[PDB]
UniProtKB/Swiss-Prot annotation, chains B, C:
Tissues in which the protein is found: Ubiquitous. Isoform Mdm2-A, isoform Mdm2-B, isoform Mdm2-C, isoform Mdm2-D, isoform Mdm2-E, isoform Mdm2-F and isoform Mdm2-G are observed in a range of cancers but absent in normal tissues.
Species this protein is from: Homo sapiens
Gene designation: MDM2
Signal peptide (from-to): none
Assembly and oligomerization: Interacts with p53/TP53, TP73/p73, RBL5 and RP11. Binds specifically to RNA. Can interact with RB1, E1A-associated protein EP300 and the E2F1 transcription factor. Forms a ternary complex with p53/TP53 and WWOX. Interacts with CDKN2AIP, RFWD3, USP7, PYHIN1, and RBBP6. Interacts with ARRB1 and ARRB2. Interacts with PSMA3. Found in a trimeric complex with MDM2, MDM4 and USP2. Interacts with USP2 (via N-terminus and C-terminus). Interacts with MDM4. Part of a complex with MDM2, DAXX, RASSF1 and USP7. Part of a complex with DAXX, MDM2 and USP7. Interacts directly with DAXX and USP7. (Microbial infection) Interacts with herpes virus 8 protein v-IRF4.
Induction of expression: By DNA damage.
Protein name: E3 ubiquitin-protein ligase Mdm2
Function comment: E3 ubiquitin-protein ligase that mediates ubiquitination of p53/TP53, leading to its degradation by the proteasome. Inhibits p53/TP53- and p73/TP73-mediated cell cycle arrest and apoptosis by binding its transcriptional activation domain. Also acts as a ubiquitin ligase E3 toward itself and ARRB1. Permits the nuclear export of p53/TP53. Promotes proteasome-dependent ubiquitin-independent degradation of retinoblastoma RB1 protein. Inhibits DAXX-mediated apoptosis by inducing its ubiquitination and degradation. Component of the TRIM28/KAP1-MDM2-p53/TP53 complex involved in stabilizing p53/TP53.
Parent-record interval covered: 26 to 109 of 491
Compartments in which it is found: Nucleus, Nucleoplasm; Cytoplasm; Nucleus, Nucleolus; Nucleus
Other remarks on this protein: MDM2 RING finger mutations that failed to ubiquitinate p53 in vitro did not target p53 for degradation when expressed in cells.
Annotated region described as Necessary for interaction with USP2, given as residue ranges: 1-84
Length: 11, 84, 84, 11
């Protein structure tokens, strides 16, 4: 899981 | 205005965790930027240079490389890959 | 809903090229993610781990580190740094 | 100028 994948779960 | 990516562009957005089949153009641009950073397709030294040959992104563009300064080219790539 | 970052958070958004003083929460999150990637504050190995001590971002949070999985913590940081 | 700085000029 990439940073962007984790980060996009915030929205 | 919501836009609707064609399948290859949709695959690219899903690869960074986008979870929808429609987005605003701003959102498409945000996800595309996340993809380029994630894959480190930009030159570390002069960071407007993107080399995308043999990447999914290169297939979308139909070009091996581009500069982020080429706004007409980038917008045109995106539109070619939308269901309008 | 548009939100209005306080000055330190605004400085962070400007540092990646955001050009406004109000944004949606989605946009604030997008820019914050761009900032973390740009500064490579996440662990290359387990990419939910962010270490932000002695960075502008650490000053906003008031913590040296966090996991991207800590959604309450991240949302709360953002709100603490908005003019509501 | 960072990648994100250049990229954000698209919007």
């Amino acid at each position: 899981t990439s940073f962007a994948e984790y980060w996009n779960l915030l929205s | 205005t919501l836009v609707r990516p064609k399948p290859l562009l949709l695959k690219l957005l899903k690869s960074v965790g986008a979870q929808k089949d429609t987005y605003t153009m701003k959102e498409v641009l945000f996800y595309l930027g996340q993809y380029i950073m994630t894959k480190r397709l930009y030159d570390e030294k002069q960071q407007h240079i993107v080399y995308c040959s043999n990447d999914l992104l290169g297939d979308l563009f139909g070009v091996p490389s581009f500069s982020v300064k080429e706004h007409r080219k980038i917008y045109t790539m995106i539109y070619r890959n939308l269901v309008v």
